[PDB]
């Protein structure tokens, strides 16, 4: 009915805004995890490059 | 402000005489027949004339 349409539409739009809040929360969870992952990858690559430079210096000394 | 306070207390203590769950309420009342146009024009104000 008409009042069914009113109640359903209004508080279902409230539930939809709640779902948008939940999706924004999940995106904020994923963003910092991606940041930590890429920072770990970059630090690993930096440590590897320092290791290879030390290996080249050892080969030069030999 | 005493008149205002009596009005607020009367409205809130009569507000518990309803029946609801989570997406709506319903109430019942009695109206004398020579008060039907006044209540009808007063309840014509609300959302989609509920």
TrEMBL record, chain B:
It comes from the Bacteria. It is found in: Membrane. Belongs to the V-ATPase 116 kDa subunit family. This is V-type ATP synthase subunit I. It comes from Thermus thermophilus (strain ATCC 27634 / DSM 579 / HB8). The chain holds residues 252 to 301 of 652 of the full protein.
């Amino acid at each position: 009915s008409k009042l069914e349409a009113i109640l359903s539409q209004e508080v279902e739009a409230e539930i939809q805004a709640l779902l948008q809040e939940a999706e924004a929360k999940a995106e904020a969870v994923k963003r910092e995890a991606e940041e930590k992952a890429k920072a770990l990858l970059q630090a690993r690559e930096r440590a590897l490059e320092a290791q290879y430079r030390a290996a080249l210096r050892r080969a030069e000394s030999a | 402000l005493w008149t205002r306070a009596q009005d607020e207390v009367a409205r809130l203590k009569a507000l518990e005489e309803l029946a609801s769950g989570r997406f709506g309420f319903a109430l019942l009342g009695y109206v004398p027949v020579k008060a039907k146009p006044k209540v009808e024009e007063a309840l014509a104000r609300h959302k989609e004339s509920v």
